[PDB]
Design a protein around this ligand. Structure first.
Ligand SMILES: Cc1c[nH]c2ncnc(C(=O)N[C@H](CC(=O)O)c3ccc(Br)cc3)c12
Length: 167
């Protein structure tokens, strides 16, 4: 039993809810919140911009130190950093950006990072300003993630479409 509330169960291990991931994290304080990161950990907009803003830019400060030491992530890759005031940890996961021409097959690799954590709060990877089809992102999620994932979808209209079209 965990503290996530109001989720629709899609499969044995995948759950979905119309919610602002920022507000959801502040309420649950999950062990892991997933960020929709880019390889430079520049948290400018979308999920990343919103999460970083909620940490009062502490996420960005920590991320800049990480990049200065380690260099950029790979598309499809991830790193674990602090969750600041939102979660114990933040798993920064880089899904492919379609508005940069990146291979959508990398979306499966991105979701594989979730399997290293027993429970996660997460957005749909590559959705929103990353330009991929969110229906597809949900399908890859369900078919790749085996650990317990609680998906927050900011847009109510998108949430209803995801639920109504889910096979
Ligand atoms: C901005 C924001 C604040 N709080 C949030 N909680 C949840 N999600 C989002 C958000 O930007 N989501 C979109 C898709 C959707 O509309 O769910 C999305 C955009 C880029 C990528 Br890469 C992946 C997903 C937010």
């Amino acid at each position: 039993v965990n503290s996530f509330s109001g989720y629709l169960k899609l499969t044995d291990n995948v759950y979905i809810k119309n919610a602002d991931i920022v507000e959801e994290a502040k309420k649950v304080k999950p062990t892991v919140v997933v960020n929709a990161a880019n390889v430079y950990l520049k948290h400018g907009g979308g999920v990343a911009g919103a999460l970083n803003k909620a940490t009062n830019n502490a996420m960005q400060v920590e991320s800049d130190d990480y990049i200065a030491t380690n260099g950029p992530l790979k598309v499809g890759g991830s790193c674990v950093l602090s969750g600041h005031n939102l979660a114990k940890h933040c798993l920064h996961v880089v899904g492919p950006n379609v508005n940069k021409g990146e291979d959508i097959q990398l979306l499966k690799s991105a979701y594989e990072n979730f399997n290293q954590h027993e429970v996660l709060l997460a957005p749909l990877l590559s959705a929103g300003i990353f330009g991929a089809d969110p229906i597809h992102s949900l399908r890859v999620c369900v078919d790749t993630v085996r650990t317990n994932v609680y998906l927050a979808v900011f847009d109510k209209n998108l949430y209803d479409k995801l639920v109504s079209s889910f096979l």
